[PDB]
Design a protein around this ligand. Structure first.
Ligand SMILES: O=P(O)(O)C(O)(Cc1cccc(-c2cccc3c2oc2ccccc23)c1)P(=O)(O)O
Ligand SMILES: O=P(O)(O)C(O)(Cc1cccc(-c2cccc3c2oc2ccccc23)c1)P(=O)(O)O
Ligand SMILES: O=P(O)(O)C(O)(Cc1cccc(-c2cccc3c2oc2ccccc23)c1)P(=O)(O)O
Ligand SMILES: O=P(O)(O)C(O)(Cc1cccc(-c2cccc3c2oc2ccccc23)c1)P(=O)(O)O
Ligand SMILES: [Mg+2]
Ligand SMILES: [Mg+2]
Lengths: 294, 294
């Protein structure tokens, strides 16, 4: 049915058709960090910062969900920020508050039936200030009020870089009360607040690297790196990524290599020896910004 | 001193000089999975399989360590294999036994003062057969006999894909006996058998994906993907990867972007809008084999 759709068709299909294919073939869980906010704004907008990023974020989340992806995991704030200015810190908490209180995004969560969750070490690492305690309350509240939404799940990562200590404490308490260690499923439910399947793909940008989706990484998490920041994500780019993951990463059926002609195995040998030192991930720097070569 | 070495010089330097730079600047911990064994053999060798892969593996580990990398984490066998033939399974255990008993590699561990460790769920997942129980004993034994070696550390991953349940059980036992949860450091020591710093880089090949180094991944783990399988790794490729990680991934000093000319910020804007849909990780398939485009 959907097994032999070509990339050309995939790229031409109506949005609703792509969604049906994804809903059926995956990716079910996609990691999409929001980063490069500052440079995107100053490069593609230069109204108000926080609002521009907020709406742009909604645009992309809307895009991801309308393409049929059930769950999106979005790291948005990592430890690093506590080591930045105080004004920079306040700025962050304001952005955090937006995701949980701003009217336009709350409307978005409702219209697209999105259940929102927060993960990470923010309850411990967020400033003990009034603003910080308010953010935590807002996070807990949004998670509960949107729990009736079932179409999509959105997991925001706030200091969600290393869950080791958190898993340890959760397991100890779980064993104390239950008498047995929690299962993997229960460990995940404890960290994300709900069970979430392993990530099927991660879309980053710039330097090849992944981060902030503990417990959900697998050799099957397809990795992609766009040249431009998260906010630049176009329709075409997303579809080419979805197509690669669905149809190309795990090609079927596979051939019986022991049954290939001498020429085939020879053309293949040449594909590998062609450019003997070819490697993706090595880059060059321009204006302090790293860009992948080749 | 070593801060402004150019790539050209880096590529021309004697091995011993590169090692000194790495020993000083890192990467301290590198992940290098061994995969593509079958296709490498049939493509670049076609004596005996197991021995060819064994010696090739030593060649590469020798290369990695002689370039100054202290610790190499090498996933070598993952769950998948238990779902393959029985002959394929026996073949694996034989390869496993080699890493721990074969004379030439034992000599290698001694000559380069390498402490070897094994991580993963192999104690539980390895066949309860005689061969399986023998492999476990061999693994434990090698870890102890090489513990006096201090120059390098080698961590072999055998079913080391998801440490969640293992961390949970380890934490519960640790709390029982210690009265308090283990620290992150202790959790890592418990999984790898020794403390190991976060991975500074991961070198894979083919499809962009990472796997089997639980707890050691960070946004700072630089990712690289060669076109050809692990065994093809050349001197030039390794140096270009090392250079990128050491000097380019974290460029210093950074510029004051709010202080850049209108043209600079304009050339930059064009670098991002140039090829608006550019993305690394999307590929094409040839003979059932995926190759990254662009
Ligand atoms: O873009 P990101 O938000 O990811 C960040 O790297 C900062 C940054 C990196 C690279 C370029 C820029 C950038 C580019 C063009 C114009 C301006 C930039 O940053 C500022 C600050 C103040 C005025 C203009 C610009 C900012 P961050 O550390 O603030 O997250
Ligand atoms: O500028 P970046 O988002 O790249 C980052 O500096 C984090 C940050 C620092 C200061 C302010 C914000 C911020 C402020 C207002 C709104 C939003 C912010 O970040 C996001 C992400 C997604 C949606 C809205 C906002 C983010 P980073 O740690 O992710 O590099
Ligand atoms: O190369 P890998 O060892 O990673 C593996 O993908 C198998 C494989 C993938 C792609 C190509 C080949 C290959 C290529 C050329 C010749 C032959 C290949 O496999 C066989 C088997 C028997 C005879 C010849 C070849 C093997 P695996 O599942 O056995 O690990
Ligand atoms: O052929 P691959 O090594 O790619 C793999 O099939 C695993 C495997 C299956 C069957 C036999 C072996 C094997 C047998 C003998 C020696 C060695 C083997 O794998 C390695 C890796 C590194 C050094 C020696 C050996 C490995 P994979 O699960 O890693 O894809
Ligand atoms: Mg940033
Ligand atoms: Mg293989």
């Amino acid at each position: 049915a959907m097994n032999l759709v070509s990339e050309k068709e995939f790229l031409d299909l109506p949005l609703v058709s792509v969604a049906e294919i994804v809903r059926c073939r995956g990716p079910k869980v996609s990691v999409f960090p929001f980063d490069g906010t500052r440079r995107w704004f100053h490069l593609e907008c230069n109204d108000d910062y926080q609002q521009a990023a907020l709406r742009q974020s909604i645009r992309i989340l809307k895009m991801l969900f309308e393409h049929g992806i059930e769950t999106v995991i979005s790291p948005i704030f990592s430890d690093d920020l506590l080591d930045r200015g105080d004004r920079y810190i306040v700025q962050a908490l304001e952005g955090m508050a937006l995701l949980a209180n701003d009217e336009e995004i709350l409307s978005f969560y409702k219209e697209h039936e999105v259940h929102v969750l927060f993960y990470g070490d923010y309850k411990k690492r967020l400033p003990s200030t009034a603003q910080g305690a308010a953010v935590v309350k807002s996070f807990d509240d949004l998670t509960i009020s949107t729990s009736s939404n079932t179409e999509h799940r959105l997991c925001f990562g706030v200091f969600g870089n290393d869950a080791a200590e958190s898993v340890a404490q959760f397991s100890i308490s779980w064993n104390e009360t239950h008498g047995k260690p929690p299962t993997r499923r229960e460990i995940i439910e404890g960290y994300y607040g709900e069970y979430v399947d392993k990530a099927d793909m991660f879309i980053g940008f710039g330097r090849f690297s992944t981060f902030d989706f503990p417990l959900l990484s697998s050799g099957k998490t397809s990795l992609y790196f766009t040249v431009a920041p998260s906010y630049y994500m176009t329709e075409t780019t997303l579809r080419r990524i979805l197509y690669d993951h669905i149809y190309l990463r795990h090609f079927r059926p596979k051939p019986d290599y022991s049954a290939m002609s001498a020429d085939q195995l020879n053309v293949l040998r040449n594909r590998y020896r062609a450019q003997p030192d070819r490697v993706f991930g090595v880059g060059c720097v321009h204006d302090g910004i790293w860009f992948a070569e080749g």
